[PDB]
Design a protein around this ligand. Structure first.
Ligand SMILES: COc1cc2sc(C(=O)CCC(=O)O)cc2cc1/C=C\COc1cc2cc(C(=O)CCC(=O)O)sc2cc1OC
Lengths: 177, 177
């Protein structure tokens, strides 16, 4: 299926390449700013999986309690002819009653955006019904892959959600565990 | 199918975002070094499509007449929560009898690498026969998309090839047109 390929590709072509080097980048940033307790960036990459496929580019739009703090120092790697291909990742603070309750690297799984866009292109032969079905399958497949993945054990968290409570509280729910 | 999704995703999630800004980046680099004639970087992104799905990270390995010249100045854009997500691209010189015959931005379509890797993972339920079939379908679909794509008219060239003459000569064949 479309989702099956997208999930395997997002894993092989992205997660597999950034997750083994993420914890060393996170440890470097926390040790540079002596970040302890709530101000210490979580050791895991938090991946937003909206089932509606609505992927905005600014996280401070889906929820105001998600605020950009810093960029995680870039990772570079020679990739498919691109010398020093850059892997940029953003660190966010999660607010609760105005104060910083948690700190983590956060981003959306960009294949969910593709699925929505695909449903808008006549040439794609892909319906809105296909988009919701493939969205659920993409999440389930990514979950199945990461469950067995050696690169991505204790350094990745999937956050699947359906808008009917709070995204910030949901990230914080995972962060507090 | 797996290829159909991969081609639409590579287009929507990558080509659609870098191709409208590529020619301005190319024009900036050529004007910075007063590059004219053979030393002038081609206005198109050259995408390598090996039908065997063999995607190495160093182009100077598939053919020695492909030599790294410079990095095209990075493009940055806020993308799915990643602030200033970096789009790095590499400029290559194409050699003929030791001398520079052409200059172009060159890279492999990374979804072809995913397809090969997918065929190696037992959980993917994807055979070597599926990999070759999906590889051909990925190329054909990408060609179909780019043919009608408004972002990607005169600024993208697909180079599909099957190893049985010369990759460098093949890129040069397109460059000389
Ligand atoms: C959303 O879908 C894509 C997005 C990108 S972005 C990308 C490149 O930047 C080219 C170089 C590279 O692969 O690193 C290739 C792809 C390919 C696809 C197509 C299928 C999805 O599989 C991938 C996801 C994927 C996401 C990538 C990211 O960098 C995450 C951030 C973002 O998408 O902007 S790399 C990447 C590679 C994938 O397959 C090779």
């Amino acid at each position: 299926s479309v989702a099956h390929g997208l999930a395997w590709s997002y894993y092989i072509g992205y997660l597999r390449l950034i997750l083994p080097e993420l914890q060393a980048r996170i440890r470097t940033y926390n040790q540079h700013y002596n970040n302890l307790l709530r101000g210490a960036v979580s050791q895991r990459l938090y991946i937003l999986l909206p089932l509606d496929c609505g992927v905005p580019d600014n996280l401070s739009m889906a929820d105001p309690n998600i605020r950009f703090l810093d960029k995680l120092p870039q990772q570079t790697a020679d990739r498919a002819g691109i010398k020093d291909r850059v892997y940029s990742n953003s660190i966010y603070e999660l607010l609760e009653n105005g104060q910083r309750a948690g700190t983590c690297v956060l981003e959306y799984a960009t294949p969910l955006q593709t699925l929505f866009a695909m449903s808008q292109y006549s040439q794609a032969g892909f319906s809105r019904e296909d988009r919701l079905e493939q969205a659920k399958l993409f999440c389930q497949t990514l979950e199945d892959i990461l469950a067995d993945a050696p690169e991505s054990q204790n350094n990745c968290r999937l956050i699947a959600y359906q808008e009917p409570f709070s995204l910030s509280q949901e990230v914080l729910r995972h962060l507090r565990q």
